[PDB]
Amino acid sequence: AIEEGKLVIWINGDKGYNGLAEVGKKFEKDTGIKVTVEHPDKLEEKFPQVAATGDGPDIIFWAHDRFGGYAQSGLLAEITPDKAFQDKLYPFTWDAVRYNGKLIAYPIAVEALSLIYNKDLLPNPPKTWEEIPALDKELKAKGKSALMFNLQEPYFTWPLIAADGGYAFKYENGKYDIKDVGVDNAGAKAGLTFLVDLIKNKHMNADTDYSIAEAAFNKGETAMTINGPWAWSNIDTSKVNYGVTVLPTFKGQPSKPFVGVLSAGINAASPNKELAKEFLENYLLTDEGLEAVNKDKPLGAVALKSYEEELAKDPRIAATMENAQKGEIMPNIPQMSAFWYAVRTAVINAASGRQTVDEALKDAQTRITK
Numbered sequence: 001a002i003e004e005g006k007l008v009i010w011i012n013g014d015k016g017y018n019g020l021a022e023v024g025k026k027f028e029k030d031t032g033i034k035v036t037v038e039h040p041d042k043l044e045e046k047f048p049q050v051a052a053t054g055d056g057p058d059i060i061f062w063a064h065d066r067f068g069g070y071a072q073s074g075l076l077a078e079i080t081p082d083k084a085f086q087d088k089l090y091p092f093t094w095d096a097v098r099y100n101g102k103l104i105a106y107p108i109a110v111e112a113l114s115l116i117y118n119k120d121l122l123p124n125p126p127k128t129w130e131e132i133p134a135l136d137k138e139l140k141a142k143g144k145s146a147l148m149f150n151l152q153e154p155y156f157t158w159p160l161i162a163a164d165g166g167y168a169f170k171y172e173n174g175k176y177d178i179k180d181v182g183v184d185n186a187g188a189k190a191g192l193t194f195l196v197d198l199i200k201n202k203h204m205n206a207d208t209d210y211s212i213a214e215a216a217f218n219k220g221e222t223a224m225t226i227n228g229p230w231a232w233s234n235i236d237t238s239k240v241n242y243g244v245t246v247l248p249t250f251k252g253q254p255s256k257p258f259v260g261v262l263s264a265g266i267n268a269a270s271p272n273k274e275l276a277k278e279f280l281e282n283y284l285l286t287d288e289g290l291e292a293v294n295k296d297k298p299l300g301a302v303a304l305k306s307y308e309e310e311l312a313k314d315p316r317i318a319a320t321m322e323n324a325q326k327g328e329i330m331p332n333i334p335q336m337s338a339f340w341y342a343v344r345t346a347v348i349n350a351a352s353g354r355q356t357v358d359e360a361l362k363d364a365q366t367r368i369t370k
């Protein structure tokens, strides 16, 4: 319940939290504030729980998509970036953390899923989704696999679902229409259908999750996987000669990944607000600060223009920018949690066989717009 001296930070496990701790030091030994960093479980679901009682971390990291609900629940502080600072970050990243005009977080990095392939097995990576089933038929005969990604989190299948048409919330004259949802239109159904078909034709397993797929690929068992910049660290460690490129098209439409902006929001019940502003504005959001977290686990494209300039040389980041470009930037409205819940079940249910695509996506549309 508060700290009055020190900064407690919270950031997901697949993020470079040990590097964040690095930055905490250069900030402590420079000012004298002891910065503790944590990677609790389901922090996105727990931060609001604790922050309600007036506890939790001083700073919480998470993709902007959850920040509108937090802001609504009154758990976040309005940040004070002057006209000068904001100039350092891309204007569209500031739009990501803007809840009703107000700014409720500092954009850290822009994330987008990309197609990671095994250069030795697949020197010529598939360009259409449609050519994957025949590709797996050939590979299955070599003991190998064509593709494997986490089906347990909708974020991973959304690119295919959005490709020929699906969408979360329609953007109208200035706002997102919470009643106009596209989880059950013709394109949403086609996309998921194609995925259900892959499974039914045994070119994929409906149980695959993050662990399983990171293993299949890093061990050299599957020719491809779909993951984020944060996944490159464990791959470099395996040494697998991989490539990061544009996701496959579907029905000729590029895959459309939901774009996330890693962000640092200040707890509303924190007494160290000025510290958080200082830590984030002058230490983290520097070239050195971000570079300290990127060395641990890649952030992907960063909000900081000065550091992104040094990062866009990397083809993995070039590929990240191209997929983000072809995808839509996520909404931050409180409804995004209802959306993700509903769509998670639909995809999970549809994949196992518990519901038909039609039944799944229909139930989601109903739950979401209820």
Ligand SMILES: O=C[C@H](O)[C@@H](O)[C@H](O[C@H]1O[C@H](CO)[C@@H](O[C@H]2O[C@H](CO)[C@@H](O)[C@H](O)[C@H]2O)[C@H](O)[C@H]1O)[C@H](O)CO
Pocket (backbone or CB within 6 Å): 012, 013, 014, 015, 044, 061, 062, 063, 064, 065, 066, 111, 153, 154, 155, 156, 228, 260, 261, 262, 263, 340
């Ligand atoms: O801010 C960073 C995230 O917390 C990140 O460290 C985690 O990993 C990534 O993968 C997530 C999905 O596994 C993305 O979550 C997004 O989608 C899910 C539904 O699939 C939704 O619940 C989240 O609100 C939404 O952000 C992350 O954006 C991405 O960074 C994340 O903690 C893992 O759940």
